[PDB]
A paper describes a structure:
Our refined structure reveals that EcUppP is composed largely of ten membrane-embedded α-helices, contrary to previous predictions that it would contain between seven or eight. Although EcUppP crystallized with one molecule in the asymmetric unit, analysis of the crystal packing shows a crystallographic dimer with a twofold symmetry axis perpendicular to the plane of the membrane. Intriguingly, analysis of the helical packing arrangement reveals EcUppP has internal pseudosymmetry within each monomer, with a twofold rotation axis parallel to and bisecting the membrane midplane, which relates a five-helix motif encompassing respective reentrant regions. A prominent feature of the EcUppP structure is the large cleft open to both the aqueous periplasm and the hydrophobic acyl core of the bilayer. Electron density for a single monoolein lipid is observed in the cleft with the well-ordered glycerol headgroup bound in the deep electropositive basin near a number of highly conserved residues we believe to be central to phosphatase action and with its more dynamic lipid tail oriented along the hydrophobic channel and exiting at the base of the opening to the membrane hydrophobic core. From our structure, Ser27 unambiguously fulfills this role with its side chain projecting from the N-terminal end of helix α2 into the active site, where it forms a strong hydrogen bond (2.7 Å) with the secondary alcohol of the bound monoolein glycerol headgroup. Remote homology detection with Phyre2 identifies similarity to the P-loop motif found in dual specificity phosphatases (DUSPs), where the role of the conserved arginine is coordination and electrostatic polarization of the phosphate moiety of a phosphothreonine or phosphotyrosine allowing a cysteine nucleophile (located at N-6 in the P-loop and not conserved in [name]), to attack and optimally promote subsequent hydrolysis and phosphate release.
Disruption of the biosynthesis or recycling of C55-PP halts peptidoglycan biosynthesis and subsequently results in cell lysis.
Numbering used by the authors:
A (entry chain A), B (entry chain A): 4 to 273
Amino acid sequence: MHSLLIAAILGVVEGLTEFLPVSSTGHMIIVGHLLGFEGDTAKTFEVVIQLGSILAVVVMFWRRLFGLIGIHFGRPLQHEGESKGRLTLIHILLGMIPAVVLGLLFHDTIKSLFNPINVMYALVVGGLLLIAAECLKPKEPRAPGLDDMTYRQAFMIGCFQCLALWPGFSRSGATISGGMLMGVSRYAASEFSFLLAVPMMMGATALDLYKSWGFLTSGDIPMFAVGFITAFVVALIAIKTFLQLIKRISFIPFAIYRFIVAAAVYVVFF
Amino acid sequence: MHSLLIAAILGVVEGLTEFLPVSSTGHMIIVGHLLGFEGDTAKTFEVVIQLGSILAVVVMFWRRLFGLIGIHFGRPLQHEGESKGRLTLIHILLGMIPAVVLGLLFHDTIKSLFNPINVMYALVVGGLLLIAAECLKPKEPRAPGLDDMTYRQAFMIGCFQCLALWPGFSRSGATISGGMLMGVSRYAASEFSFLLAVPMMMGATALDLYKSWGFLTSGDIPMFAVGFITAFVVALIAIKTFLQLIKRISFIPFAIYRFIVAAAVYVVFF
Ligand SMILES: CCCCCCCC/C=C/CCCCCCCC(=O)OC[C@H](O)CO
Ligand SMILES: CCCCCCCC/C=C/CCCCCCCC(=O)OC[C@H](O)CO
Ligand SMILES: CCCCCCCC/C=C/CCCCCCCC(=O)OC[C@H](O)CO
Ligand SMILES: CCCCCCCC/C=C/CCCCCCCC(=O)OC[C@H](O)CO
Ligand SMILES: CCCCCCCC/C=C\CCCCCCCC(=O)OC[C@H](O)CO
Ligand SMILES: CCCCCCCC/C=C\CCCCCCCC(=O)OC[C@H](O)CO
Ligand SMILES: CCCCCCCC/C=C\CCCCCCCC(=O)OC[C@H](O)CO
Ligand SMILES: CCCCCCCC/C=C\CCCCCCCC(=O)OC[C@H](O)CO
Ligand SMILES: CCCCCCCC/C=C\CCCCCCCC(=O)OC[C@H](O)CO
Ligand SMILES: CCCCCCCC/C=C\CCCCCCCC(=O)OC[C@H](O)CO
């Protein structure tokens, strides 16, 4: 029973935590274990609802995303920055390259890192990195807006995205931290993290969906639909609220909260 | 036979490759396999001769290293930089923290990465990172000299040192690349890499020597002495020559050479 209610709860958790630097995997294993929804169907379910959150970024950054791949039909794209530069597809590619290289080489080792004890450590270490980024970032951002970003900043963020190969570390936490440490403002680094997440997660989800295509032909459709659609709406709200929120608060509260989630992981599983 | 001659050959290889961004582990497994010197005694031997190369940095950077820990008795230390700043022990600590955290957590996974196929990949990827650092570094260094380095640069270099946990990647390659990508000059980033190597390798060697303390009581003394002493002299020459060399050449030749070493690893073992 409550198959649709469980789908909506996980969809809310996915939509809130996928793009905030608080680790969706950590929250998924907790709530999934509390709701008794574990196993291959649950893991396949949580891969499907990730597409819902991806679509939220695609919808929110529609004009810029199609602009990046060379499709522009009408109104000029809003300029986000103090300089006359423009984010390009090269920025995105440099942001992808490091994690794509290491992810394919270390595929088998990453698969064995989904133990709750490894996730708990990744939550804490990811939280420590956010704090370090807040302590060490330059006083004056080098890239105030998304369109001020340089190839060097983008590649360095890509290098930090390799830390996200550690389950629980949070891709948004790793890339936002790297961006701030490269002098990208909190706002711009969050945006670039969201844009970078689209090609990274679509390829990763397509690889996960291909290898776990085994499910009920039509029985999982009601659950998968409700979860997918909920994650989309909540991610729309969360991203919009986060970008407005991060303009006047730091990542310290998110780092402290990750320490609480790590403690939650321990008590739930041990 | 040729126990002293084999010790000197490996000592030369250790002293040349330990602090150049060309991976000593890659060269050790090649030459060790060609000389038929493999096994627990050989692995213990190659840990001992690393102390010889460490001592070379200690001798070459004697005044600065003791200065960093607060021991200064007489002539003021030479100022290396355009600003009025000074490298401090905090720079060193920030350079150590990331690799120390991840190295202790991922200890068991790192132990299983010494397969020649993993070393070959690390040689290539490390070579690609050197090229990227050469392509993406700022036109004007932010830290021309060692004493111009900031806490942010030091911590970021520490983050890149985590890549060195991959056997074959080369600690010097990872940290020099990170430094150049943070706007530290080639010369200063090499120096900081050497200084950072002293606490990192002394702790790592002490952990390796403790767990492999099993050897011939006095039979290995002649081999271990000749190797240790050779690695010291060659590292003295190599470091001095490298620092003079890097002032007018880039790391491109070192990156190309790593690709040749990766091919050598394949042909020797496969
Ligand atoms: C990265 C390139 C995108 C590739 C994947 C394409 C999306 C996949 C299919 C979606 C069907 C639903 C289409 C819904 C279209 C919404 C467009 C929109 O709402 O844009 C509004 C405004 O421009 C912004 O706020
Ligand atoms: C276009 C080609 C794309 C190829 C893609 C290959 C990338 C390698 C795998 C990455 C996911 C596996 C890492 C596991 C991360 C889960 C832990 C986590 O929660 O981080 C996510 C966070 O919610 C977000 O902010
Ligand atoms: C990082 C702090 C160092 C801790 C570990 C200490 C070294 C270990 C013992 C060495 C015995 C041999 C001592 C040899 C002393 C050489 C000093 C020297 O030659 O310095 C010359 C000049 O100051 C520079 O070029
Ligand atoms: C003070 C406490 C210190 C604690 C120390 C814990 C560090 C973790 C282990 C690091 C070595 C294992 C990584 C294996 C690297 C071998 C591959 C290689 O060749 O890189 C070296 C290169 O020669 C150089 O430039
Ligand atoms: C950790 C694993 C990483 C291994 C993967 C490495 C692959 C090579 C990547 C990029 C090549 C370098 C691209 C250089 C782009 C040129 C940019 C430039 O020249 O300057 C920037 C511009 O002037 C201001 O925005
Ligand atoms: C939503 C976005 C998803 C997009 C996913 C990324 C797809 C990669 C696209 C192009 C790079 C193709 C690889 C070949 C690299 C060529 C880059 C290059 O040539 O840059 C030099 C520049 O043209 C100086 O004139
Ligand atoms: C049986 C299982 C019951 C599960 C019940 C699910 C309903 C949770 C709803 C909202 C809380 C969302 C929790 C995650 C909120 C994001 C974390 C966060 O952002 O905290 C940082 C801080 O707010 C920076 O200001
Ligand atoms: C990848 C694993 C990493 C996890 C480990 C993270 C541990 C926290 C590290 C450092 C705390 C921050 C130290 C902040 C030092 C203050 C520096 C500063 O405030 O500015 C610099 C100075 O003004 C100009 O040189
Ligand atoms: C060859 C060198 C090898 C040395 C190996 C490193 C040993 C660590 C030393 C001190 C840090 C001790 C950890 C405690 C961190 C305190 C740092 C701190 O307080 O910095 C603030 C500063 O004092 C603002 O006033
Ligand atoms: C049976 C085994 C026989 C083994 C014979 C051992 C004697 C090798 C002596 C010198 C070559 C040293 C090789 C490593 C040299 C460093 C690599 C390097 O620096 O190349 C980069 C380029 O020079 C940038 O200008």
